[PDB]
Coordinates of C-alpha atoms (C1' of nucleotides) in Angstrom, one line a residue:
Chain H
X1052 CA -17.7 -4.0 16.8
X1053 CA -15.2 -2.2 14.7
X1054 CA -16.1 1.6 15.0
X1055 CA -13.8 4.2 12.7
X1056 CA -13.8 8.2 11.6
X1057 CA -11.2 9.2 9.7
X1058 CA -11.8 13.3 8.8
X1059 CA -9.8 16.0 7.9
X1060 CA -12.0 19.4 8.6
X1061 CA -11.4 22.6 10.2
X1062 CA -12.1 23.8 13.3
X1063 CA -15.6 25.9 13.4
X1064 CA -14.8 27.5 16.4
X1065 CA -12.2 27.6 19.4
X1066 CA -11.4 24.8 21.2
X1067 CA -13.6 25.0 24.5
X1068 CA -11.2 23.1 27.0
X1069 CA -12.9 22.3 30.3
X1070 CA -12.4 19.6 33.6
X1071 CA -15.1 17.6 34.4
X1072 CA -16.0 17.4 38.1
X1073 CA -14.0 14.2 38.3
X1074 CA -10.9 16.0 37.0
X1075 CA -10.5 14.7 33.9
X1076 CA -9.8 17.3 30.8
X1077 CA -12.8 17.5 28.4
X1078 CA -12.9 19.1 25.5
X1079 CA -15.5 19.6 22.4
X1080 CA -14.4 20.9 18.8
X1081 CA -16.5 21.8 15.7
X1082 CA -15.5 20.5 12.5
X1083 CA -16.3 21.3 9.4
X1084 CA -15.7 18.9 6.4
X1085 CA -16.4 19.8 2.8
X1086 CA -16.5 17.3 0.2
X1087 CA -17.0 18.6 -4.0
X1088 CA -19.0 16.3 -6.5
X1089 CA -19.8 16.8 -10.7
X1090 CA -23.6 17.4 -10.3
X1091 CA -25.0 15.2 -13.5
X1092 CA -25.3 18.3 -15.8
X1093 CA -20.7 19.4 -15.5
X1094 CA -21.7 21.5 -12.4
X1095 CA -19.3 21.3 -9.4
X1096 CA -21.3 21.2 -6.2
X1097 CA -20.1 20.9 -2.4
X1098 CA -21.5 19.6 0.8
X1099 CA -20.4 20.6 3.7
X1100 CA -20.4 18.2 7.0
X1101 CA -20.4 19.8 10.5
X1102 CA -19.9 18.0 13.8
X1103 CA -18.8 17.7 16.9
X1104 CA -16.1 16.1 18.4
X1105 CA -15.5 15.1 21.7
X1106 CA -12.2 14.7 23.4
X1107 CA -11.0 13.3 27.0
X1108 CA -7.9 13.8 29.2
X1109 CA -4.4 14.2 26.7
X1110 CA -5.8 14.8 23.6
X1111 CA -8.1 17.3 24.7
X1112 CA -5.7 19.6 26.3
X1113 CA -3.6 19.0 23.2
X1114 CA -6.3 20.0 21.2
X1115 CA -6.8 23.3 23.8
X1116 CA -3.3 24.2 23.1
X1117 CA -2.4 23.4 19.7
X1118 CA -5.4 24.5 17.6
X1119 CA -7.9 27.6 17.4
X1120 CA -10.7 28.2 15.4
X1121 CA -9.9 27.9 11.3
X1122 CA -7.5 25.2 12.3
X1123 CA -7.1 22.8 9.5
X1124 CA -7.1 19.4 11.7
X1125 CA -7.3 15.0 10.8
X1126 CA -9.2 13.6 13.3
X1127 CA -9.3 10.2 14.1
X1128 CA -12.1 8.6 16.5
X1129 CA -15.4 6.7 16.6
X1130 CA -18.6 7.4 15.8
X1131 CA -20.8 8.4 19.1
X1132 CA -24.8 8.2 20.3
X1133 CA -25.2 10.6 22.5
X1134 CA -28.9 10.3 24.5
X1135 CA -29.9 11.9 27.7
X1136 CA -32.6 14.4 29.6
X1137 CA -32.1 18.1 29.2
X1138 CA -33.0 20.1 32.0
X1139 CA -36.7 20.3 30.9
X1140 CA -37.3 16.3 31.3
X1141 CA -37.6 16.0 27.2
X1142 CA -35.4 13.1 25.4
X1143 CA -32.9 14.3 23.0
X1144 CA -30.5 12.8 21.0
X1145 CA -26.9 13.2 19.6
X1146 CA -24.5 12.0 17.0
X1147 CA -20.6 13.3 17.6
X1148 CA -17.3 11.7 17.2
X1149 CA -15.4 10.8 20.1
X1150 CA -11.5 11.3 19.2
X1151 CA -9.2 9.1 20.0
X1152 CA -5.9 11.3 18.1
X1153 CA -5.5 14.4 16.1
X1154 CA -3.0 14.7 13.3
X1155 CA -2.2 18.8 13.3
X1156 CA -2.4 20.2 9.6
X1157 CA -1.6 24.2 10.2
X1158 CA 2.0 24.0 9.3
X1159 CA 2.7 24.9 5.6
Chain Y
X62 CA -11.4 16.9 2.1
X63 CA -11.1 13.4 3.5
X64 CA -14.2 11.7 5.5
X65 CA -14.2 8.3 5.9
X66 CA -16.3 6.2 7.9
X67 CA -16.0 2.5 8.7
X68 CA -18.6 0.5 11.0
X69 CA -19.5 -2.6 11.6
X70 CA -23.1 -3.3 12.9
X71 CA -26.2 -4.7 12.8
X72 CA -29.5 -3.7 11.0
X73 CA -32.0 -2.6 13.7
X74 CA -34.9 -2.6 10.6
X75 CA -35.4 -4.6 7.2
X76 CA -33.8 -2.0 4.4
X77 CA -36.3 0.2 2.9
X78 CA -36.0 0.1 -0.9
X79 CA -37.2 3.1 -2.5
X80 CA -37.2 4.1 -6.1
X81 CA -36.4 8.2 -6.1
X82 CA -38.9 10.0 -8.9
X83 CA -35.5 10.7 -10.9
X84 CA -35.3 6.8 -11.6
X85 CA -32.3 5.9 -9.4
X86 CA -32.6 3.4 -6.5
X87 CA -32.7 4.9 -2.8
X88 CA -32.2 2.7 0.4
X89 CA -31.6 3.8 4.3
X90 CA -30.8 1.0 6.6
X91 CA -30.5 1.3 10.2
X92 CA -27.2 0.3 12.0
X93 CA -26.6 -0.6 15.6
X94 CA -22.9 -0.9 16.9
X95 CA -21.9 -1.6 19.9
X96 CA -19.1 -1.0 21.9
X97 CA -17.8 -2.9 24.8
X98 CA -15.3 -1.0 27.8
X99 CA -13.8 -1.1 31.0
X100 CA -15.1 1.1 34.0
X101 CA -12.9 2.9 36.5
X102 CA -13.8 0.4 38.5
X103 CA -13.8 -2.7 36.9
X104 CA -17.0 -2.9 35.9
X105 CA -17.1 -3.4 32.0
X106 CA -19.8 -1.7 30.0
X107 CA -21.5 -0.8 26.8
X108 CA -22.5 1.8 24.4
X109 CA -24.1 1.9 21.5
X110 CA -24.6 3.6 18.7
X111 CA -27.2 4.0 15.8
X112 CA -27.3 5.6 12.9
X113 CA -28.6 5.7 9.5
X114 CA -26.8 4.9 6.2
X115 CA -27.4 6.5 3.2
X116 CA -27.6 3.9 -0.2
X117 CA -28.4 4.9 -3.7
X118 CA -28.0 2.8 -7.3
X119 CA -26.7 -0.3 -7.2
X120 CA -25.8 -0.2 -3.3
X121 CA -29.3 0.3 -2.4
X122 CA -30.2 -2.7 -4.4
X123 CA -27.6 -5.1 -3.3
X124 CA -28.5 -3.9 0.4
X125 CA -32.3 -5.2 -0.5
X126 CA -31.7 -8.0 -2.0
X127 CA -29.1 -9.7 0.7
X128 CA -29.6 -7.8 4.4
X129 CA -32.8 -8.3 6.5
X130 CA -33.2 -7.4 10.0
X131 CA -30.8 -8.4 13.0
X132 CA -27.6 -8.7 9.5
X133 CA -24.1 -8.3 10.4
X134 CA -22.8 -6.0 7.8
X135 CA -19.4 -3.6 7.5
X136 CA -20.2 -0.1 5.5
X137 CA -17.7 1.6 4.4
X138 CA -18.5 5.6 3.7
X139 CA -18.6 8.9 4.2
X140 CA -20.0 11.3 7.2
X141 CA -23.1 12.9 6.3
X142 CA -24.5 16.6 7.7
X143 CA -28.0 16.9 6.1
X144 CA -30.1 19.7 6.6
X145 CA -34.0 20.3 5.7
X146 CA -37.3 22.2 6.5
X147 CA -39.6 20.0 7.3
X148 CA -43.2 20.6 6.3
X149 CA -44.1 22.6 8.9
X150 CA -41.8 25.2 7.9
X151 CA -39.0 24.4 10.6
X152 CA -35.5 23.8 10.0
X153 CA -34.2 20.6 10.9
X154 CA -30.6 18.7 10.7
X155 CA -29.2 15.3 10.8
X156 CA -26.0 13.3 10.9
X157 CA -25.9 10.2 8.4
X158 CA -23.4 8.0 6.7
X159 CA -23.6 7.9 3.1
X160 CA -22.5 4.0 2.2
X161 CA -19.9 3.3 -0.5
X162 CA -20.0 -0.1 0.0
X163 CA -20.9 -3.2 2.5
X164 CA -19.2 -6.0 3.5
X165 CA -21.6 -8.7 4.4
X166 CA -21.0 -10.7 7.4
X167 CA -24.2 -13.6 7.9
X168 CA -22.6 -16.2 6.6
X169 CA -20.9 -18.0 9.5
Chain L
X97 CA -11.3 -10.2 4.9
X98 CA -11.3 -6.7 5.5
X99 CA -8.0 -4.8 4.1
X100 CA -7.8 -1.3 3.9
X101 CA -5.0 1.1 3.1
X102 CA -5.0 4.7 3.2
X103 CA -1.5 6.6 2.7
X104 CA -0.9 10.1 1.7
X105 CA 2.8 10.1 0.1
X106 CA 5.1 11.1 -2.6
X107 CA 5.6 10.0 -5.6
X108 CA 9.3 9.1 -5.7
X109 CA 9.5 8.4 -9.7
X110 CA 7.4 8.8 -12.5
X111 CA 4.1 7.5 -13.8
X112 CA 4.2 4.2 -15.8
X113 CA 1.2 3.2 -17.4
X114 CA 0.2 0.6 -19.8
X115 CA -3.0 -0.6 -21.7
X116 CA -4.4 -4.6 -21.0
X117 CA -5.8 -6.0 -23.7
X118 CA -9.5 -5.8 -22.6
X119 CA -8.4 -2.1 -22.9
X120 CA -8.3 -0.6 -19.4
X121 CA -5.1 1.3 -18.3
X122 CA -2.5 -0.2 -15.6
X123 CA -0.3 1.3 -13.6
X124 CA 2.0 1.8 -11.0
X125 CA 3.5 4.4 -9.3
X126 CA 6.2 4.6 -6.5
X127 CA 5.4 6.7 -3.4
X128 CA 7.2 7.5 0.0
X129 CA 5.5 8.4 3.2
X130 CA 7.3 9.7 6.3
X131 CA 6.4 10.0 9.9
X132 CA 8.0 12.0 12.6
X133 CA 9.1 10.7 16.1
X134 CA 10.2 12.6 18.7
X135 CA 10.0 9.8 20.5
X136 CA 13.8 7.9 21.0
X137 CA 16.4 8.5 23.9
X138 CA 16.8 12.2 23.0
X139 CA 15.7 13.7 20.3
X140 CA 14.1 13.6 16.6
X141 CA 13.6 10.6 14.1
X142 CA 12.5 10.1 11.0
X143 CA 11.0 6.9 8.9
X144 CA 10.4 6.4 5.1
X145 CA 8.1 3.9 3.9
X146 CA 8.5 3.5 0.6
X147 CA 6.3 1.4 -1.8
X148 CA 4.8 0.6 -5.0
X149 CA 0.9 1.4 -5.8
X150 CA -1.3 -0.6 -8.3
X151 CA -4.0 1.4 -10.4
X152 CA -6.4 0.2 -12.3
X153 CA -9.0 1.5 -15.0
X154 CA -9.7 5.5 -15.0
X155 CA -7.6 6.0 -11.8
X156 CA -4.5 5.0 -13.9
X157 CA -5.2 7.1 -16.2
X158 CA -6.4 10.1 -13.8
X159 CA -2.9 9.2 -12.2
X160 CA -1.1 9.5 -15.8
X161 CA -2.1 12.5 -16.9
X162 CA -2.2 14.6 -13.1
X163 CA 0.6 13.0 -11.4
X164 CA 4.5 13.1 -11.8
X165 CA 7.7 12.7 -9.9
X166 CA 7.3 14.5 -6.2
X167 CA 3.8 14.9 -6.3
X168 CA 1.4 14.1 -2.9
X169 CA -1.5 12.3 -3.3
X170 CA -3.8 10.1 -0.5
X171 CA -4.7 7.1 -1.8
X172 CA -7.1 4.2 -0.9
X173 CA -6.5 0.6 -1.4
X174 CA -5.7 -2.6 0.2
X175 CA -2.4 -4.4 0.7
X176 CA -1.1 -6.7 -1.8
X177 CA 1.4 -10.0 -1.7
X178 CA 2.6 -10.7 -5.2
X179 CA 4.9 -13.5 -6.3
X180 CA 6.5 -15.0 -9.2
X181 CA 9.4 -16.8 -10.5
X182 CA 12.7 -15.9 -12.1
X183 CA 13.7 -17.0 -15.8
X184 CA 16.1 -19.4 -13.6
X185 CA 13.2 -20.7 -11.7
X186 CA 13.6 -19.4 -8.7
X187 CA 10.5 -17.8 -6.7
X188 CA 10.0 -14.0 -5.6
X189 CA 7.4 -12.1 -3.7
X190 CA 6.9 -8.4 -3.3
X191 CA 4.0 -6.1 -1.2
X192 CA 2.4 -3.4 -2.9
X193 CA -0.5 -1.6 -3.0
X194 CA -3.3 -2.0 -4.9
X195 CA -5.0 1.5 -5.1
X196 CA -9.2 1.8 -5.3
X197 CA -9.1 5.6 -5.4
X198 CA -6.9 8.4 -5.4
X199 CA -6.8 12.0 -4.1
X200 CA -4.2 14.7 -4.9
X201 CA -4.0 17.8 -2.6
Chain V
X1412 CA 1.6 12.3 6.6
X1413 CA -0.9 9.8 7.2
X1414 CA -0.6 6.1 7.4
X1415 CA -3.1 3.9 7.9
X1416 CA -3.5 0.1 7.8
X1417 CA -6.9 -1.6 9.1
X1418 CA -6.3 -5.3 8.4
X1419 CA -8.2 -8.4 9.3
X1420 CA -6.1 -12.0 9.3
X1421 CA -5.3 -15.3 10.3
X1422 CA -2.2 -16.3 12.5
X1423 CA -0.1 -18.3 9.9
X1424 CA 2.4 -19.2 13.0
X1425 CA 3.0 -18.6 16.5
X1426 CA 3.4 -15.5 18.5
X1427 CA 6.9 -14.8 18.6
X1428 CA 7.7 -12.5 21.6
X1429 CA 10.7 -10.8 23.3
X1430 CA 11.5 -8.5 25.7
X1431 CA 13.6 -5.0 25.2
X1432 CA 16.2 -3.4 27.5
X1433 CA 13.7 -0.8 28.3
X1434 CA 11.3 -3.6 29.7
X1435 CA 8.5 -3.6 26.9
X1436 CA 7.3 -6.4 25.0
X1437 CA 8.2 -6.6 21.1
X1438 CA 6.5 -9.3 19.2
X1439 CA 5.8 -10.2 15.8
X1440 CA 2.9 -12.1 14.0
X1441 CA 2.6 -13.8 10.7
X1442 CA -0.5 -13.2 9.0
X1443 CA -2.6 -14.2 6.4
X1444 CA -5.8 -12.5 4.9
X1445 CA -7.8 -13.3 1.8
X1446 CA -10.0 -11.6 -0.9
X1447 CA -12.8 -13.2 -2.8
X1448 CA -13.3 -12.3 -6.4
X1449 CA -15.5 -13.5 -8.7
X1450 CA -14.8 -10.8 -11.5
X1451 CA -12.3 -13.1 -13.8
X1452 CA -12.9 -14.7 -17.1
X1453 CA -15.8 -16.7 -16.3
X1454 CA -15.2 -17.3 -12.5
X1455 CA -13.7 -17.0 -8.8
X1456 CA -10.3 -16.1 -7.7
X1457 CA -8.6 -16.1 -4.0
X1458 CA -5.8 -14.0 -3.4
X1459 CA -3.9 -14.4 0.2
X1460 CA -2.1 -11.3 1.3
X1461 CA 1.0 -12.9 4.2
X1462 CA 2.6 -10.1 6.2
X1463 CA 4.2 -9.7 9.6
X1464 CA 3.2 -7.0 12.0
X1465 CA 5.5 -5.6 14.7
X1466 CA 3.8 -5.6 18.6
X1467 CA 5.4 -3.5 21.4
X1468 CA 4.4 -2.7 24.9
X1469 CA 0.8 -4.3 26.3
X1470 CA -0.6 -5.0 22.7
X1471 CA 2.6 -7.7 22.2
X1472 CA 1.9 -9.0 25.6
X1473 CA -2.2 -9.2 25.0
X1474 CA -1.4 -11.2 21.6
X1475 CA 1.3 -13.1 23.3
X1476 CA -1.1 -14.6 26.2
X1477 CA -4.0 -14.7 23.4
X1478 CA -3.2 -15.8 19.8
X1479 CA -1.9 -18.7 18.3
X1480 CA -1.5 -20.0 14.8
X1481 CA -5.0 -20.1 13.3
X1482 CA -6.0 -17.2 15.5
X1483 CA -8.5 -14.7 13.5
X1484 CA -7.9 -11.0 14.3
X1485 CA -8.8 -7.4 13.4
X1486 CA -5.3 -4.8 13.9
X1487 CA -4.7 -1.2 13.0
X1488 CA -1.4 0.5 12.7
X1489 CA 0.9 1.5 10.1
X1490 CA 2.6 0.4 7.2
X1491 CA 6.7 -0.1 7.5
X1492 CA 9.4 -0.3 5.1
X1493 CA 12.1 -2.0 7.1
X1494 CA 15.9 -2.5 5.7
X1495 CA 19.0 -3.4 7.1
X1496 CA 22.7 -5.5 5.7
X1497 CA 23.2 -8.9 5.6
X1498 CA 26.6 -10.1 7.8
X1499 CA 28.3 -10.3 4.1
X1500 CA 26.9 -6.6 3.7
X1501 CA 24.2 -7.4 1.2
X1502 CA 21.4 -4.6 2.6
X1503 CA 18.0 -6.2 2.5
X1504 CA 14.1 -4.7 2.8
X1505 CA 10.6 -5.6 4.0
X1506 CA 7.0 -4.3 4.4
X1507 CA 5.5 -4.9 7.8
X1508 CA 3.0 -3.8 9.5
X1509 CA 3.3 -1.7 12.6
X1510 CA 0.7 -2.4 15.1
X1511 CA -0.9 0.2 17.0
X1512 CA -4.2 -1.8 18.1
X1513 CA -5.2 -5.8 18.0
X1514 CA -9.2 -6.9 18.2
X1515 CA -9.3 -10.5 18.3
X1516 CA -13.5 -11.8 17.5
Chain B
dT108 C1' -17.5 6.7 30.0
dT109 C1' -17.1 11.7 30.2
dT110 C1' -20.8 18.0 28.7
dT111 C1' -25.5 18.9 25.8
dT112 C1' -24.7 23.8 20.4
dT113 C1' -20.9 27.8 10.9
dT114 C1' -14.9 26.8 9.1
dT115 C1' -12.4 28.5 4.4
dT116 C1' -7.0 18.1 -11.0
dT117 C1' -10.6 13.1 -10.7
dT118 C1' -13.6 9.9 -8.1
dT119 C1' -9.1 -9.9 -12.3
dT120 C1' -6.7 -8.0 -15.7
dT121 C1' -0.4 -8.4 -16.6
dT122 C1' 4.3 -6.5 -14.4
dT123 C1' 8.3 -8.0 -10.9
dT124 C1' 11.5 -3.0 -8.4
dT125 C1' 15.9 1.1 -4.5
dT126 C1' 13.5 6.3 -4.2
dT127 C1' 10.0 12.3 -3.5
dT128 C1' 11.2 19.5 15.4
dT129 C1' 3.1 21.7 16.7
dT130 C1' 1.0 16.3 20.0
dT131 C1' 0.9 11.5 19.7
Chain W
dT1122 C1' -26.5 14.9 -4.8
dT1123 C1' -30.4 11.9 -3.6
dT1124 C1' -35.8 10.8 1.4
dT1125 C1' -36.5 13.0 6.5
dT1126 C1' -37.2 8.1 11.9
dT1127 C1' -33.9 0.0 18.6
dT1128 C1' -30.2 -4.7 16.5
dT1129 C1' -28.2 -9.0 19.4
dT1130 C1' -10.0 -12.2 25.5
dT1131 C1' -7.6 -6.5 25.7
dT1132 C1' -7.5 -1.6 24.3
dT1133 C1' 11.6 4.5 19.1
dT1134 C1' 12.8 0.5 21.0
dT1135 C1' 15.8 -4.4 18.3
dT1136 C1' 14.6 -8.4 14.7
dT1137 C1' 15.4 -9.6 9.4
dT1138 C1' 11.3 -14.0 7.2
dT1139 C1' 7.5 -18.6 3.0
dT1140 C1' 2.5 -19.5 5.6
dT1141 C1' -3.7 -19.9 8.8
dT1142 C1' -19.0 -19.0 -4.5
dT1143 C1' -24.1 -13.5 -0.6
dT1144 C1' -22.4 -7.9 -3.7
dT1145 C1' -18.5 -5.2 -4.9

DNA sequence: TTTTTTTTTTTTTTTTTTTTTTTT
DNA sequence: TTTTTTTTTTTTTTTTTTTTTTTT
């Protein structure tokens, strides 16, 4: 089943780049995407849309050494369910995008 | 800034059609994709992920009156970062799409 | 069918906008969109895809009176075959894009 | 800047597949998508949108051993404005699409 | 297949063409 | 601007064209 985020945000924090015991790079970013709307009165409003992103092998060293917190960034990826135990034995549950390229926005 | 979203799933729930007290149509449907993929080995797996998608006006209608249950149905729209205290008095958060638009897919 | 553009480019000429008769505005804009590749035996490349947009309704107009020659904008749309014939009969065909929305940064 | 085409079509011929010097596949597909719309002057319209879209490596060999004419399928890539000159030096154009993914349902 | 917590302009219709070195 | 909780096939390169009535 087709599966597609497209975002252009900036980067809430530095790039945390480790390995996972298999070896494989891992890496998570924070994003932060605002979006403006006319509320019904002529007011201008904004929302703002944070989430994670998670990255694998390449792209997320690329990630570590390309971008740094404030980082103006277009993400592209799918749409993730993350489920699983914490260390307590209590269900929690998780929505982040899993990135699949970045498209680097810090050059002006 | 851009946020697009673009999934294609199934409803895990009939739509809930709601009327908000400001007159305009509300309607939250709940979307499982899946996703099929290769193990290191050569096993080939699954995840899958659900979500919630945000309708209002004339989307939340059309979502009522042609998607039940087990539908096949693209949505096309935005990420969504929504953020609340809940009744109790504690601060809670969630990640939704907020639909533009479906793309029905029943008939076969 | 599913068909979905989104391009963020150029425009390489001016607006030009007209009125139907129902009323609502037309229009069509040129744009150019490049990607960089670093990619070939060597070095550094460059490509330019140029092509024309369709708008339709308020986004024409929004496009008329905020856009111009040189200026970026994303826009959304889908993919478009259009064909016709000559005053001599004979047959052309042409791929543009017909805008839903438009952005300008 | 960004270039994005998500596309779902029929095969309207054969895969047509080649190798390059390199090694890697290159192949190219005809394809054929529609659009319903019931909007006109009393009633409903089809409009067919015909491209080709440019393969390379594994993807052209993946739609080479599974897609034939009829074939439905689901790509993402790019949009490309390809020219070049005719042997009596007439240059020519064409949109395409560029590949980067195939999902056949 | 992979862990586990606030960044810094608007929103069916007709027509028939030549241009504004950050990774991948 | 808007509330508040498990559905049912694979993943820089060259070439130069005519076709497989669910809402919006």
């Amino acid at each position: 089943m087709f599966n597609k985020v497209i975002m252009v945000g900036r980067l809430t924090r530095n790039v945390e780049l480790k390995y996972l015991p298999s070896g494989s790079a891992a890496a998570t970013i924070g994003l932060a995407t605002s979006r403006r709307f006319k509320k019904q009165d002529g007011t201008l409003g904004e929302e703002v849309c944070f989430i994670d992103a998670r990255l694998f092998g390449r792209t997320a060293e690329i990630a570590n050494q390309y971008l740094s917190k404030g980082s103006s960034v277009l993400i592209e990826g799918r749409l993730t369910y993350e489920s699983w135990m914490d260390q307590t034995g209590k269900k929690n549950s998780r929505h982040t995008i899993t990135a699949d390229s970045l498209q680097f926005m810090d050059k002006k």
